[PDB]
Ligand binder design. Structure first.
Ligand code: HEM
Ligand code: HEM
Ligand code: H44
Ligand code: H44
Ligand code: H4B
Ligand code: H4B
Ligand code: CL
Ligand code: CL
Ligand code: GD
Ligand code: GD
Ligand code: ZN
Lengths: 403, 400
């Protein structure tokens, strides 16, 4: 038997047959579930490459064709001669889309088929890397009409260091570890800020200072590049009916572009493959602005809203958090920057689940990450049971290049 | 082998060593996590294990009385096939089963539980008296007190005491000739049973259901709850004067009556327990779930919210004011209730106490994090380990 999966809003029942294809292992055992944790060789290369090629040729409905066999033979011969192999361009595009499709913590996978894949596997230097990244930022920002993209830098290979982007995203605000223990700017970026200053960046002193990019070419210390200010589209935050909100001087950036994850395709590894989509509004409104360990503006806003913050039972937190999220959505819509609210995102994810059940017999999904951080049970994904497992091609965490 | 558990708000680290004592097996494997699923004469070994637990907790470990109790239960099961709990063992086993319940955010309170020993019960008319005394004690005119009543255990060659209702207080669910449900859709099945067993149905959205109590080997008998025994809170809102006219209400006492209590290999299919509500249970789940009363759009219409675009966050604004109404209405009626911020702060304290007490604490993140304002509560940022300890409250098949 395969896991029986139930939607409790509808009563409907599916079986996740796809999970039985899970290659790598997760952190859970029959004795204990660790699903809530944030952080969970010629012959082994070949069976991963074979499986990936099988996936490619299924996607185009040419399984068992002559072209399928020849390509498997081709990969085998290259691995036997060199210990490794090169993806065809079409396989790279397919592999990056599958990795997105396979990502269990991504609620935006209804879009997985619409992904611009920039092939930067011929990149030679940190300077050319910066050029690829600027072109990515320009294409994806598209002056507010955001377009999903990934740029794939050269694969890891023996006898040469990795390409790495040290920043966790292409656009990050500085976090200045103030001496009195506190932080000015984004506390999530204190470490990368200190590394940037360490490498000669002249720091600012604001709360929304865009960080430079620390770019690492093989066997080279990271190099500092400043993003052209006209390349970094930002949204000033205001609230549709709370006019004093604008005076908080809050901003956020248009483009979420994760740059520190490793892309794995057919046993090949791409330690530098930054990817971007668009924001779901709770990421900015609830997490980035109201996490106690982030900008932590909740109490300041509620006090401005004249709420009774002396008792929890007034729900001043819930009320201020809702208005902050309203401000984010209003501000991005006003600026004409693509953004999706958590209701539409989770509804579209529910559609994705139904498509994937028909297409592949299941969908790896991490409930705790799919359910938005406010209003969870008001969205349909709350009531959907979900099976979490690791498929390849995949986006993976990897150690920071300085640790 | 000891899982590392991190709090991402504070950056603190602990190690759950208690998980190594997980007796049963959950649904997860290294291949796939099923954590989000709602439903995941060796009696001696379990009986042995619980006794050791007991005497260890009272610092009587391996003492004279320890070995004596051990040898008593061996004779009982040899003579009868089962054994009898001492009243103190039963109290300790009830408290431990609550303390071990991974999905309970209310466990800061676990040492304060009134155990009613109903194991001398026979016939459903007596069940009903035990239950009514439970309901009366636990309600306490609104100053709610946690309690469990423990009816006779299952044994071979003989039926079971079962409470057919999932809770002692449930509103009726009446299906309509247009398919819809007037009342609580969660209770459409027990409502048709109550009718099929003679109950005159109401026609209201908050008709309190009768109790279908079942003594062993007999059909269940309908018992009507004295309306003065069932404390109910009419729902009003502190500033939205029209909210009261919606006619919403809920009941004071959450009393779960369909779970099985397991202690030392013994099984009590009828052991209703009650505490008090966390406000999001009523204001978010019971009233705003699509498959329950589903009142969200009604409230948003009364608030004159723009309901044609999700991005107005009309669902979020309506949900908050409904939870406000619940908190205001219970406090105004002097019925104990806890908001999700106070409860999750208390559960965090419980986690620290349990870390020091036992080296960990089984917790089901998906159920501990509230259904609104998740990341505004500290539990959201707390990694958790889920595992099954005994004594335990377990799900069980419906009697029919
Ligand atoms: C197109 C619009 C998209 C939306 C609205 C979206 C939404 C989200 C959200 C809300 C998260 C959780 C982030 C967090 O809480 O830190 C997430 C995670 C993730 N997203 Fe998507 N995403 C989109 C596109 C993409 C694309 C284009 C890719 C890759 C090609 C991608 C891959 C991932 C991955 C791998 C994760 C997991 C990251 C982790 O484990 O930390 N997403 N996404
Ligand atoms: C004292 C105040 C208490 C509060 C505020 C509280 C709160 C909660 C909440 C919010 C849930 C989730 C229920 C749901 O979402 O359906 C829960 C579950 C649970 N509670 Fe507590 N509870 C309390 C007392 C108790 C007591 C006295 C017991 C037993 C002696 C108990 C045993 C359980 C169990 C076994 C579950 C799991 C239910 C399931 O898996 O369906 N709780 N509690
Ligand atoms: N950074 C840490 N913790 C940590 C914090 C957050 C995350 C999650 C990373 N998420 C950023 C992200 C990922 C994926 C999507 C988004 N948001 C988006 N909408 C998109 C980004 C790209 C395409 S869509 C944001 C992981 C570890 C650590 C502290 C100490 C050691 S590691
Ligand atoms: N039973 C179902 N599913 C299901 C639904 C809810 C739960 C959770 C149990 N709900 C009642 C409950 C349990 C525990 C605590 C509370 N609330 C309380 N605050 C307390 C109750 C007793 C002491 S505290 C409510 C489990 C399974 C089904 C639906 C349709 C067919 S079967
Ligand atoms: C402890 C817990 O795993 C952690 O706070 C998770 C919960 N769910 C999440 N879900 C999303 N989308 N993003 C997150 O950062 C987190 N954090
Ligand atoms: C599918 C999912 O497991 C289900 O909806 C769970 C999620 N978390 C929950 N948490 C609580 N407290 N109560 C619930 O009923 C649920 N339902
Ligand atoms: Cl972000
Ligand atoms: Cl309830
Ligand atoms: Gd105004
Ligand atoms: Gd009106
Ligand atoms: Zn698990």
């Amino acid at each position: 038997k395969f896991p029986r999966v139930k939607n409790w809003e509808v009563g409907s029942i599916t079986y996740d047959t796809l999970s039985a294809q899970a290659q790598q292992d997760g952190p859970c055992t029959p004795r204990r579930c660790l699903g809530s944790l944030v952080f969970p060789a010629p012959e082994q290369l070949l069976s991963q490459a074979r499986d990936f090629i099988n996936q490619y040729y299924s996607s185009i409905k040419r399984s068992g064709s002559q072209a399928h066999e020849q390509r498997l033979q081709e990969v085998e011969a290259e691995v036997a001669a060199t210990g490794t192999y090169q993806l065809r361009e079409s396989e790279l595009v397919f592999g990056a889309k599958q990795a997105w499709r396979n990502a269990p913590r991504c609620v935006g996978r209804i879009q997985w088929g619409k992904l611009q894949v920039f092939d930067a596997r011929d990149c030679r230097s940190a300077q050319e890397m910066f050029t690829y990244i600027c072109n990515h930022i320009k294409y994806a920002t598209n002056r507010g009409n955001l377009r999903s993209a990934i740029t794939v830098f050269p694969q890891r290979c023996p006898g040469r260091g990795d390409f790495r982007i040290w920043n966790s995203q292409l656009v990050r605000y500085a976090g200045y570890r103030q001496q009195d223990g506190s932080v000015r700017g984004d506390p999530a970026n204190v470490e990368i800020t200190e590394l940037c200053i360490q490498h000669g960046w002249t720091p600012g002193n604001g709360r929304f200072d865009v960080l430079p990019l620390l770019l690492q070419a093989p066997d080279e210390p990271p190099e500092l590049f400043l993003l052209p200010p006209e390349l970094v589209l930002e949204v000033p935050l205001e609230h549709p009916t709370l006019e004093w909100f604008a005076a908080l001087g809050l901003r956020w950036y248009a483009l979420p572009a994760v740059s520190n994850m490793l892309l794995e395709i057919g046993g090949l590894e791409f330690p530098a493959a930054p990817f971007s989509g668009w924001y779901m509004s709770t990421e900015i409104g609830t997490r980035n602005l109201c996490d106690p360990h982030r900008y932590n503006i909740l109490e300041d806003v509620a006090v401005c809203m004249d709420l009774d913050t002396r008792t929890t039972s007034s729900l001043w937190k819930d009320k201020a958090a809702v208005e902050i999220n309203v401000a984010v959505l209003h501000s991005y819509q006003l600026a004409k920057v693509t953004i999706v609210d958590h209701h539409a995102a989770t509804a579209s994810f529910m559609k994705h689940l139904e498509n994937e059940q028909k297409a592949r017999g299941g969908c790896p999904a991490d409930w705790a990450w799919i359910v938005p951080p406010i209003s969870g049970s008001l969205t349909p994904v709350f009531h959907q049971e979900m099976v979490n497992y690791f498929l390849s091609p995949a986006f993976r965490y990897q150690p920071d290049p300085w640790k």
